[PDB]
Design a protein around this motif. Structure first.
Motif, PDB file in Angstrom:
ATOM      1  N   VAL A 176       0.864  -1.193   0.000  1.00  0.00           N
ATOM      2  CA  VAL A 176       0.000   0.000   0.000  1.00  0.00           C
ATOM      3  C   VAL A 176       0.891   1.230   0.000  1.00  0.00           C
ATOM      4  O   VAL A 176       0.683   2.172  -0.762  1.00  0.00           O
ATOM      5  CB  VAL A 176      -0.928  -0.013   1.225  1.00  0.00           C
ATOM      6  CG1 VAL A 176      -1.741   1.259   1.271  1.00  0.00           C
ATOM      7  CG2 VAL A 176      -1.846  -1.230   1.224  1.00  0.00           C
ATOM      8  N   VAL A 177       1.912   1.212   0.874  1.00  0.00           N
ATOM      9  CA  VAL A 177       2.800   2.363   1.033  1.00  0.00           C
ATOM     10  C   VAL A 177       3.607   2.581  -0.225  1.00  0.00           C
ATOM     11  O   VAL A 177       3.812   3.718  -0.664  1.00  0.00           O
ATOM     12  CB  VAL A 177       3.672   2.150   2.291  1.00  0.00           C
ATOM     13  CG1 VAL A 177       4.730   3.207   2.488  1.00  0.00           C
ATOM     14  CG2 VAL A 177       2.722   2.058   3.487  1.00  0.00           C
ATOM     15  N   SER A 178       4.064   1.480  -0.838  1.00  0.00           N
ATOM     16  CA  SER A 178       4.791   1.661  -2.106  1.00  0.00           C
ATOM     17  C   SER A 178       3.943   2.257  -3.199  1.00  0.00           C
ATOM     18  O   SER A 178       4.380   3.122  -3.977  1.00  0.00           O
ATOM     19  CB  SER A 178       5.241   0.251  -2.477  1.00  0.00           C
ATOM     20  OG  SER A 178       6.043   0.277  -3.605  1.00  0.00           O
ATOM     21  N   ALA A 179       2.683   1.793  -3.260  1.00  0.00           N
ATOM     22  CA  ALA A 179       1.748   2.348  -4.227  1.00  0.00           C
ATOM     23  C   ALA A 179       1.531   3.848  -4.017  1.00  0.00           C
ATOM     24  O   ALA A 179       1.404   4.622  -4.963  1.00  0.00           O
ATOM     25  CB  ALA A 179       0.404   1.601  -4.176  1.00  0.00           C
ATOM     26  N   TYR A 180       1.482   4.293  -2.776  1.00  0.00           N
ATOM     27  CA  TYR A 180       1.354   5.725  -2.478  1.00  0.00           C
ATOM     28  C   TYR A 180       2.584   6.468  -2.974  1.00  0.00           C
ATOM     29  O   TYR A 180       2.455   7.430  -3.739  1.00  0.00           O
ATOM     30  CB  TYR A 180       1.086   5.962  -0.962  1.00  0.00           C
ATOM     31  CG  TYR A 180       0.994   7.462  -0.734  1.00  0.00           C
ATOM     32  CD1 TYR A 180       2.086   8.198  -0.253  1.00  0.00           C
ATOM     33  CD2 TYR A 180      -0.179   8.149  -1.005  1.00  0.00           C
ATOM     34  CE1 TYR A 180       2.035   9.552  -0.041  1.00  0.00           C
ATOM     35  CE2 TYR A 180      -0.237   9.515  -0.810  1.00  0.00           C
ATOM     36  CZ  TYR A 180       0.857  10.191  -0.325  1.00  0.00           C
ATOM     37  OH  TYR A 180       0.831  11.553  -0.148  1.00  0.00           O
ATOM     38  N   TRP A 181       3.772   6.092  -2.496  1.00  0.00           N
ATOM     39  CA  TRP A 181       4.956   6.897  -2.745  1.00  0.00           C
ATOM     40  C   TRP A 181       5.392   6.839  -4.215  1.00  0.00           C
ATOM     41  O   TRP A 181       6.076   7.774  -4.696  1.00  0.00           O
ATOM     42  CB  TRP A 181       6.095   6.535  -1.760  1.00  0.00           C
ATOM     43  CG  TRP A 181       5.738   7.029  -0.396  1.00  0.00           C
ATOM     44  CD1 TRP A 181       5.422   6.273   0.718  1.00  0.00           C
ATOM     45  CD2 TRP A 181       5.659   8.399   0.001  1.00  0.00           C
ATOM     46  NE1 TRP A 181       5.153   7.121   1.760  1.00  0.00           N
ATOM     47  CE2 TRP A 181       5.289   8.417   1.350  1.00  0.00           C
ATOM     48  CE3 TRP A 181       5.860   9.621  -0.657  1.00  0.00           C
ATOM     49  CZ2 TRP A 181       5.110   9.614   2.049  1.00  0.00           C
ATOM     50  CZ3 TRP A 181       5.689  10.801   0.032  1.00  0.00           C
ATOM     51  CH2 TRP A 181       5.321  10.784   1.385  1.00  0.00           C
ATOM     52  N   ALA A 182       4.963   5.829  -4.963  1.00  0.00           N
ATOM     53  CA  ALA A 182       5.219   5.754  -6.393  1.00  0.00           C
ATOM     54  C   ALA A 182       4.554   6.905  -7.113  1.00  0.00           C
ATOM     55  O   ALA A 182       4.926   7.205  -8.255  1.00  0.00           O
ATOM     56  CB  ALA A 182       4.695   4.423  -6.895  1.00  0.00           C
ATOM     57  N   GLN A 183       3.588   7.576  -6.480  1.00  0.00           N
ATOM     58  CA  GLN A 183       2.957   8.726  -7.130  1.00  0.00           C
ATOM     59  C   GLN A 183       3.639  10.049  -6.823  1.00  0.00           C
ATOM     60  O   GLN A 183       3.131  11.097  -7.289  1.00  0.00           O
ATOM     61  CB  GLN A 183       1.467   8.809  -6.740  1.00  0.00           C
ATOM     62  CG  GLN A 183       0.728   7.555  -7.256  1.00  0.00           C
ATOM     63  CD  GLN A 183       0.851   7.355  -8.744  1.00  0.00           C
ATOM     64  OE1 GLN A 183       0.641   8.276  -9.542  1.00  0.00           O
ATOM     65  NE2 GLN A 183       1.189   6.129  -9.118  1.00  0.00           N
ATOM     66  N   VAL A 184       4.762  10.005  -6.111  1.00  0.00           N
ATOM     67  CA  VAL A 184       5.485  11.215  -5.742  1.00  0.00           C
ATOM     68  C   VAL A 184       6.865  11.189  -6.393  1.00  0.00           C
ATOM     69  O   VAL A 184       7.669  10.322  -6.004  1.00  0.00           O
ATOM     70  CB  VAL A 184       5.605  11.303  -4.218  1.00  0.00           C
ATOM     71  CG1 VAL A 184       6.334  12.588  -3.801  1.00  0.00           C
ATOM     72  CG2 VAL A 184       4.230  11.252  -3.564  1.00  0.00           C
TER      73      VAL A 184
END
Ligand SMILES: N=C(N)SCc1ccc(Cl)cc1
Length: 330
Positions: free
Chosen positions: A231-239
């Motif tokens: 979940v966290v990787s999916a979030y930070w992949a957008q930054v």
């Protein structure tokens, strides 16, 4: 009965929130960290090792005419943090926002670890998890909420934490002016002593919602949002430029970035955490690398819906015979 107290961030990052608490007769007011992830009410005190006190306000039981030593009782606790404290126990009168409990166990610190010493803004903790986690020995003690519950108009408390602003803890009633739309309630497991629930999924920014069960705790005493690595990787992949740093201890991102929001599910409802809530500032003074507010729970063993998540909602801690949790947008 009811109570209502304002909670205030301790610093410009909302690292924690403090709430004034009256202890003893005459009242001694201490600023406590209300912690729905633990179950001990402990304070800096006249018994705390002198070198371990640096700016905090202390409780002095000998100046309270209602204080009674709880004979033979001790306590010792450590936090998911890595911090800790320990000491002895008094019973005394404790009031929160006009709500009074007599006979509350007030755990007096003899020892605190350096992180406590180093934070002059927090005079102790007030635990609001289930009393089965209380550390007092040999006779475990009840939390402030458990002692008050029978007297309350309704066996509930609510957390309404602010973003870079004060908020409110209410006891015994739901303020229907403090949220928008409806409150969605969700089941709680008390088996580990926490307000443990299961989120129904997430979305990143304007992205589609991923339906997936995420078990975790509602923890006002944790600053950040700790979620599974996927979940966290999916979030930070957008930054752009975001990375997990082993040296820093988590995800960092360019301070020049505009962060996407993060949505979590509560049943069929959705709570949206604005992107700015996920910015925890330079990793060190003057750095252009900023610390992320969403981090992996992989080393922890549990997902934690900490202040980053809770402050986006109005949260009901329903202490009925079968406890539940309620979330509303605000
Ligand atoms: N809020 C608290 N005092 S402890 C939160 C936490 C951290 C780690 C684990 Cl495994 C459980 C709870």
């Amino acid at each position: 009965s009811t109570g209502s107290a304002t909670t205030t961030p301790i610093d410009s990052l909302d690292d924690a929130y403090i709430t004034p608490v009256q202890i003893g007769t005459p009242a001694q007011t201490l600023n406590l960290d209300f912690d729905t992830g633990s179950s001990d009410l402990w304070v800096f005190s006249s018994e705390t090792t002198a070198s371990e006190v640096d700016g905090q306000t202390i409780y002095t039981p000998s100046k309270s005419t209602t204080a009674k030593l709880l004979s033979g009782a001790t306590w010792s606790i450590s936090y998911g943090d890595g911090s800790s404290s320990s000491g002895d126990v008094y019973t005394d009168t404790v009031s929160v926002g006009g709500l009074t409990v007599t006979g509350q166990a007030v755990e007096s610190a003899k020892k605190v670890s350096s992180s406590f010493t180093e934070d002059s803004t927090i005079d102790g903790l007030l635990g609001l998890a289930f009393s089965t986690l209380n550390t007092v020995s040999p006779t475990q003690q009840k939390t402030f909420f458990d002692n008050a519950k029978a007297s309350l108009d309704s066996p509930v408390f609510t957390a309404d934490l602010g973003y870079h602003a004060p908020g409110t803890y209410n006891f015994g009633f739901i303020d229907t002016t403090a949220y928008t739309g409806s409150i969605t309630y969700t089941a709680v497991s008390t088996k580990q002593g926490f307000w443990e629930w299961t989120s129904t999924g997430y979305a990143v920014g304007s992205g589609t919602f991923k339906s997936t069960s995420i078990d975790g705790i509602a923890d006002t005493g944790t600053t950040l949002l700790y979620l599974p690595a996927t979940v966290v990787s999916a979030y930070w992949a957008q930054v752009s430029g975001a990375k997990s740093s082993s040296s820093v201890g988590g995800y960092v991102f360019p301070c020049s970035a505009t962060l996407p929001s993060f949505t979590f599910g509560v049943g069929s409802a959705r709570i949206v955490i604005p992107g700015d809530y996920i910015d925890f500032g330079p990793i060190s003074t003057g750095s252009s690398s900023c610390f992320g507010g969403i981090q992996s729970s992989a080393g922890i063993g549990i997902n934690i819906f900490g202040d980053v998540a809770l402050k986006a909602a109005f949260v009901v801690f329903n202490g009925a015979t079968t406890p539940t949790l309620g979330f509303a947008s605000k």
